[PDB]
Each structure stands twice: as C-alpha cells, then as structure tokens.
PDB file of C-alpha atoms in Angstrom:
ATOM      1  CA  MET A   1       0.000 -17.350 -12.144  1.00 38.50           C
ATOM      2  CA  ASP A   2       3.342 -16.344 -10.584  1.00 38.10           C
ATOM      3  CA  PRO A   3       5.635 -19.021  -9.140  1.00 36.82           C
ATOM      4  CA  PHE A   4       7.827 -16.282  -7.624  1.00 37.65           C
ATOM      5  CA  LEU A   5       4.859 -14.667  -5.822  1.00 33.07           C
ATOM      6  CA  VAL A   6       4.150 -17.994  -4.081  1.00 32.47           C
ATOM      7  CA  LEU A   7       7.870 -18.188  -3.236  1.00 36.37           C
ATOM      8  CA  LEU A   8       7.546 -14.860  -1.387  1.00 37.19           C
ATOM      9  CA  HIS A   9       4.520 -16.043   0.620  1.00 35.59           C
ATOM     10  CA  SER A  10       6.490 -19.075   1.864  1.00 35.02           C
ATOM     11  CA  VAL A  11       9.858 -17.412   2.587  1.00 32.24           C
ATOM     12  CA  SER A  12       7.854 -14.639   4.307  1.00 29.85           C
ATOM     13  CA  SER A  13       7.091 -17.018   7.201  1.00 30.71           C
ATOM     14  CA  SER A  14      10.812 -17.901   7.407  1.00 30.81           C
ATOM     15  CA  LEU A  15      11.770 -14.209   7.828  1.00 32.74           C
ATOM     16  CA  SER A  16       9.953 -13.273  11.056  1.00 33.12           C
ATOM     17  CA  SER A  17      10.048  -9.716  12.434  1.00 31.11           C
ATOM     18  CA  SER A  18      13.858 -10.117  12.606  1.00 30.69           C
ATOM     19  CA  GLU A  19      14.620 -10.381   8.863  1.00 30.39           C
ATOM     20  CA  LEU A  20      11.714  -8.015   8.118  1.00 31.58           C
ATOM     21  CA  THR A  21      13.303  -5.425  10.437  1.00 29.05           C
ATOM     22  CA  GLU A  22      16.654  -5.678   8.616  1.00 29.66           C
ATOM     23  CA  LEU A  23      15.452  -5.378   4.999  1.00 28.30           C
ATOM     24  CA  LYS A  24      13.074  -2.681   6.315  1.00 28.10           C
ATOM     25  CA  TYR A  25      15.921  -0.479   7.610  1.00 28.24           C
ATOM     26  CA  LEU A  26      17.849  -0.708   4.318  1.00 29.42           C
ATOM     27  CA  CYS A  27      14.542   0.001   2.530  1.00 28.88           C
ATOM     28  CA  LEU A  28      14.307   3.388   4.286  1.00 29.37           C
ATOM     29  CA  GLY A  29      15.515   5.535   1.361  1.00 29.07           C
ATOM     30  CA  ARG A  30      16.157   2.697  -1.119  1.00 25.74           C
ATOM     31  CA  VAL A  31      12.543   1.661  -1.810  1.00 26.61           C
ATOM     32  CA  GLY A  32      10.855   4.544   0.048  1.00 26.14           C
ATOM     33  CA  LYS A  33       9.270   5.327   3.436  1.00 27.67           C
ATOM     34  CA  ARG A  34       5.588   5.112   2.434  1.00 25.29           C
ATOM     35  CA  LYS A  35       6.227   1.559   1.181  1.00 28.63           C
ATOM     36  CA  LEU A  36       7.344   0.412   4.652  1.00 29.82           C
ATOM     37  CA  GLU A  37       4.363   2.202   6.243  1.00 29.94           C
ATOM     38  CA  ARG A  38       2.071  -0.157   4.296  1.00 30.53           C
ATOM     39  CA  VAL A  39       4.243  -3.244   4.900  1.00 31.58           C
ATOM     40  CA  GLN A  40       3.343  -5.386   7.936  1.00 29.08           C
ATOM     41  CA  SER A  41       4.655  -8.957   7.571  1.00 28.37           C
ATOM     42  CA  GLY A  42       6.798  -9.238   4.416  1.00 29.84           C
ATOM     43  CA  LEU A  43       4.733 -10.301   1.381  1.00 31.08           C
ATOM     44  CA  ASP A  44       3.440  -6.696   1.350  1.00 30.62           C
ATOM     45  CA  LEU A  45       6.831  -5.160   0.473  1.00 29.52           C
ATOM     46  CA  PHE A  46       7.410  -8.012  -2.002  1.00 29.45           C
ATOM     47  CA  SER A  47       4.062  -7.225  -3.690  1.00 32.12           C
ATOM     48  CA  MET A  48       4.891  -3.543  -4.283  1.00 30.32           C
ATOM     49  CA  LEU A  49       8.421  -4.179  -5.599  1.00 32.12           C
ATOM     50  CA  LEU A  50       7.116  -7.005  -7.817  1.00 32.86           C
ATOM     51  CA  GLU A  51       4.372  -4.650  -9.058  1.00 36.55           C
ATOM     52  CA  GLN A  52       6.902  -2.196 -10.533  1.00 37.07           C
ATOM     53  CA  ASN A  53      10.472  -1.715  -9.259  1.00 40.93           C
ATOM     54  CA  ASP A  54      12.938  -4.621  -9.549  1.00 39.62           C
ATOM     55  CA  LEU A  55      11.135  -7.939  -8.950  1.00 37.51           C
ATOM     56  CA  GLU A  56       9.877 -10.522 -11.470  1.00 35.81           C
ATOM     57  CA  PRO A  57       9.559 -14.229 -12.243  1.00 31.59           C
ATOM     58  CA  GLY A  58      13.243 -14.068 -13.249  1.00 32.09           C
ATOM     59  CA  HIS A  59      14.602 -10.747 -11.934  1.00 35.41           C
ATOM     60  CA  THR A  60      15.040 -10.054  -8.200  1.00 35.45           C
ATOM     61  CA  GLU A  61      18.589  -8.679  -7.852  1.00 36.11           C
ATOM     62  CA  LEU A  62      17.234  -5.822  -5.693  1.00 32.60           C
ATOM     63  CA  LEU A  63      15.465  -7.901  -3.014  1.00 32.40           C
ATOM     64  CA  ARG A  64      18.085 -10.682  -2.985  1.00 36.50           C
ATOM     65  CA  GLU A  65      20.752  -7.940  -2.852  1.00 36.12           C
ATOM     66  CA  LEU A  66      19.380  -6.751   0.504  1.00 35.07           C
ATOM     67  CA  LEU A  67      19.528 -10.341   1.804  1.00 32.94           C
ATOM     68  CA  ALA A  68      23.206 -10.370   0.767  1.00 33.45           C
ATOM     69  CA  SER A  69      23.864  -7.440   3.117  1.00 33.08           C
ATOM     70  CA  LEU A  70      22.113  -9.380   5.908  1.00 35.66           C
ATOM     71  CA  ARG A  71      24.569 -12.276   5.324  1.00 38.88           C
ATOM     72  CA  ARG A  72      21.710 -14.792   5.040  1.00 37.95           C
ATOM     73  CA  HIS A  73      21.837 -18.101   3.131  1.00 40.22           C
ATOM     74  CA  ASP A  74      18.506 -19.972   3.241  1.00 37.35           C
ATOM     75  CA  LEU A  75      16.552 -16.882   2.124  1.00 36.03           C
ATOM     76  CA  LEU A  76      19.046 -16.076  -0.660  1.00 35.90           C
ATOM     77  CA  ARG A  77      19.010 -19.719  -1.839  1.00 35.97           C
ATOM     78  CA  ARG A  78      15.215 -19.983  -2.247  1.00 38.49           C
ATOM     79  CA  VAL A  79      14.713 -16.504  -3.752  1.00 38.84           C
ATOM     80  CA  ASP A  80      17.760 -16.873  -6.031  1.00 39.94           C
ATOM     81  CA  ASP A  81      16.362 -20.291  -7.030  1.00 38.39           C
ATOM     82  CA  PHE A  82      13.104 -19.017  -8.572  1.00 39.04           C
ATOM     83  CA  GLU A  83      15.135 -16.106 -10.011  1.00 39.75           C
TER      84      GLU A  83
END
C-alpha cells in the first residue's frame, strides 16, 4: 500500500537514462555514492530515499527539489501531485 511508490514506478519510465543521469550527478554527495552504485533505472534510488531519508506518501521535497534544478515540468507535476 503506497500510492507514491506506484507513482515512482510510472514516472521512472518517463525519465530515461537522461533524467536519471541528471538527478544522479546531483545525488553524488547529496544522497551518497553507494546509493547510486546500487541504482540502475530510477525506482531503485526512489526506494532507498523513501525507505528513510526525505520521501513519503506526502513528503518529497528532496526528490522534487532535484527535478527543480533540472528545470523539468511533467516530472515535477506528477511527483508534486501525489505529494
């Protein structure tokens, strides 16, 4: 049970290696380096942060914040929606 988790599995396909490469660079130091080593597509990094960091059914200012630096709009609208 986690509407937001399902929202990360869908938006993950709309990120591609391009958006994953951006949030990954900013993650180097912000979230950690070992976290990116385990990541592979996108839902992986969203599963660790949601586990314990700054992600929840109604609290994702950290992840959405990175999307703000990327200057996105469709990804920030869906994520911010479930938030």
